[PDB]
Design a protein around this ligand. Structure first.
Ligand SMILES: *[C@@H]1O[C@H](CO)[C@@H](O)[C@H](O)[C@H]1NC(C)=O
Lengths: 364, 75
């Protein structure tokens, strides 16, 4: 929700910096000589970058060595090798130079796995990258630079994971409203601090738009650029929302609406009004009928959750989930004097607004 | 238990614990190069039609290289 709080930057500027220098005088001639003996060789740049330059598909050693004296067994062989440059050019035309993810034509799986293994990185980081190449591909960029002299060059920006194996936790939130018989008069409250949280260098890297995180098994792949770096005291909002150490983000409304959030090991159900909220098993049928308010059901046994007319599927991931019973926070708030429109607020922004509005009543 | 979960009835929220990071901190840049050649019978017209495809491709990349690109910005 708090995605509007995120800062902005250029993700391509890192790889474009290598592209802008690739147009510098001898630059083109430097890599040409180094890649004559072997197809893969480490190159030092004028700007001073440790760049792994790789010569993939040699058209000069095929056109001048097998098609030059003539100008069906050789046309099909040429078609096959020419196809890769025909698809790379097709991609750079519609994507205006920058392409993401990096296609198989741009870099093959055998080439990518070898490119990861040739990097001067940790033995641990290599395996993580190799086992999740599909995620690495998705995270990577490919920028067009120069064609200059008898060699086509394009910069491939791969991701680096400085933070690895540290704990992560997904926070799911849903609206908490009062459940009275009346048409209106219902006050609501939703925790806006929903998203992915990863412990990182004394702080907590928080990803408010959890959609920007890829999860393979336990591994949470996120981009720091999509994070806000928050103090460890942020986790206090889960155990004590009224803690003085941290001002817990919340949004207030009167929008008494039924919905369901499908968590990792179950589902939260915000059931309001005349809504049919139900948890069901594939065989047995309806195993739970949700009463008005905010409840939750574990994935163990339950296969589906239906709220009104929208059926949701529970995640069948193995794991133990604990129901922490407690009085719903919204009961403590007085329906009159409550600020029912705070779209982006906090526990204090509300308590201060109440303290202020109560003072006008007391003096009169 | 590898993965765990906690549901707070008081705040209408749930926390899914037991995950491990793989946060993208920076970037590794690499230059990918392709060594290209500068240049009535049915068997000779097909190799011409395919060499025309190669020439048109190299001429297309020559117009793109000058223009410098960007992902986008301001999000
Ligand atoms: C303002 O709220 C605080 C609690 O957050 C309370 O201690 C204080 O007494 C209130 N102010 C007044 C004037 O009562």
């Amino acid at each position: 929700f708090l995605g509007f709080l995120l800062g902005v930057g250029s993700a391509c500027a890192s790889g474009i910096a290598v592209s802008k220098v690739l147009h510098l005088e001898g630059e083109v001639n430097k890599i040409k000589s180094a890649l004559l003996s072997t197809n893969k060789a480490v190159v030092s740049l004028s700007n001073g970058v440790s760049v792994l330059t790789i010569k993939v598909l040699d058209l000069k050693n095929y056109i001048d060595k097998q098609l030059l004296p003539i100008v069906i067994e050789t046309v099909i062989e040429f078609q096959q090798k020419n196809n890769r440059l025909l698809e790379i050019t097709r991609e750079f035309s519609v994507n205006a130079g920058v392409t993401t993810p990096v296609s198989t034509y741009m870099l093959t799986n055998s080439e990518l796995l070898s490119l990861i293994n040739d990097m001067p990185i940790t033995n641990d980081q290599k395996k993580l990258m190799s086992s999740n190449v599909q995620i690495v591909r998705q995270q990577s960029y490919s920028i067009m630079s120069i064609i200059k002299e008898e060699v086509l060059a394009y910069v491939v920006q791969l991701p680096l994971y400085g933070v690895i194996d540290t704990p992560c936790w997904k926070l799911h939130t849903s609206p908490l409203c009062t459940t009275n018989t009346k048409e209106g008069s219902n006050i609501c409250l939703t925790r806006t601090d929903r998203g992915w949280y990863c412990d990182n260098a004394g702080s907590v890297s928080f990803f408010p738009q959890a959609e920007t995180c890829k999860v393979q098994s336990n591994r949470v792949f996120c981009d720091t650029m999509n994070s806000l770096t928050l103090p460890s005291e942020v986790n206090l909002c889960n155990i004590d929302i009224f803690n003085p150490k941290y001002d817990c983000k919340i949004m207030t409304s009167k929008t008494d609406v039924s919905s369901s959030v499908i968590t990792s090991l179950g589902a939260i159900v915000s059931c309001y009004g005349k809504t049919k909220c139900t948890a069901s098993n594939k065989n047995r049928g309806i195993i739970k009928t949700f009463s008005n308010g905010c409840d939750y059901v574990s994935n163990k046994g339950v296969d589906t959750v239906s709220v009104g007319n929208t059926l949701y599927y529970v995640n069948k991931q193995e794991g133990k989930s604990l129901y922490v019973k407690g009085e719903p926070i919204i009961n403590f708030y007085d329906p009159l004097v409550f600020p029912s429109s705070e779209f982006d607020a906090s526990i204090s922004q509300v308590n201060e607004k109440i303290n202020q509005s109560l003072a006008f009543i007391r003096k009169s | 238990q590898n993965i765990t979960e906690e549901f707070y009835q008081s705040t209408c929220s749930a926390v899914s614990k037991g995950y491990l990071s793989a946060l993208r901190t920076g970037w590794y840049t690499s230059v990918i190069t392709i060594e290209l050649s500068n240049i009535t019978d049915a068997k000779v017209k097909l190799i011409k039609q395919e060499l025309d495809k190669y020439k048109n491709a190299v001429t297309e990349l020559q117009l793109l290289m000058q223009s410098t690109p960007a992902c986008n910005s301001r999000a």
